Amino acid sequence: TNYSFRTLTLSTAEYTKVVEFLAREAKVPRYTWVPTQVVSHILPTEGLERFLTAIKAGHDSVLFNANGIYTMGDMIREFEKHNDIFERIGIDSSKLSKYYEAFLSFYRIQEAMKLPK
Amino acid sequence: TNYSFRTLTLSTAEYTKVVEFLAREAKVPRYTWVPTQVVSHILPTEGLERFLTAIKAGHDSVLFNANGIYTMGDMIREFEKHNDIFERIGIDSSKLSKYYEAFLSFYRIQEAMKLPK
């Protein structure tokens, strides 16, 4: 289609292993394709404005505003409830991949902070 | 929870990265809790006996036989269809976590075999 998502089954032990693994990848810059270093620098408490800015999504952010996504937890919640939030709100498909890539790393970091290990 | 399953959403690119990541961990010995190092050496074509032997599950294997699970692919396929296979057959809960840990890591390796990047 473009960028399909697959729901994998993650057991409690493997779950924390994967979540923390990707969190480290997102925390410490290791991606040149997508600036994750700035993404992990963003506090999810501000919203998603900085997240969009990180990928230069100054116009795509409007889609979030339309859906009521401009707060903390909402973006993650929408991801857990749907995951295809960006596709649903009307995000540009030409950059859909880049958006979803950064979004995934963000979720991992967020969960890793709550991860008991 | 012990070894409960949580649905995680994996992006196409992240999916292969995660699948291969766990396969690497389960391949090269890095755990003392679960003998995954020998598990990655096990041919899932012999059945599940070798897998049970790895963790010294010479008694729990009976539960599999009871359910009719003693063939190749059957255990993994049953995991896909049920996921609570070991729980259903009557695996000992005191070792249930370890069984599932090796089980999950094994599936990751198996899938990684067909996994490109």
UniProtKB/Swiss-Prot annotation, chains A, B:
Region (Required for tertiary structure stability of the protein): 1-28
Modification after translation: Phosphorylated in response to IR-induced DNA damage which is thought to be mediated by akt-1.
Domain of life: Eukaryota
Swiss-Prot/TrEMBL induction comment: By DNA damage.
Disruption phenotype: Reduced numbers of germ cell corpses, hypersensitive to the lethal effects of hypoxia, increase in production of males (Him phenotype), decreased lifespan and in extreme cases embryonic lethality. In cep-1 and prmt-5 double mutants, germline cell death and up-regulation of egl-1 mRNA induced by gamma irradiation is prevented. Double RNAi-mediated knockdown together with ape-1 abrogates the increased number of apoptotic germ cells in the ape-1 knockdown model.
Subcellular location: Nucleus
Tissue: Expressed in pharyngeal muscle and neurons.
Assembly and oligomerization: Homodimer. Interacts (via C-terminus domain) with prmt-5; not methylated by prmt-5. Interacts with cbp-1 (via HAT domain); cep-1 transcriptional activity may be inhibited by interaction with methylated cbp-1. Component of a complex that contains prmt-5 and cbp-1. Interacts with ape-1; the interaction inhibits pro-apoptotic activity of cep-1.
Family note: Belongs to the p53 family.
Physiological role: Transcriptional activator that binds the same DNA consensus sequence as p53. Has a role in normal development to ensure proper meiotic chromosome segregation. Promotes apoptosis under conditions of cellular and genotoxic stress in response to DNA damage, hypoxia, or starvation. Regulates germline apoptosis in response to DNA damage. Its pro-apoptotic activity is inhibited when bound to ape-1 in vitro. Plays a role in cell cycle arrest in the germline in response to DNA damage by UV-C light.
Protein name as annotated: Transcription factor cep-1
Native source organism of the sequence: Caenorhabditis elegans
Organism ancestry: Eukaryota, Metazoa, Ecdysozoa, Nematoda, Chromadorea
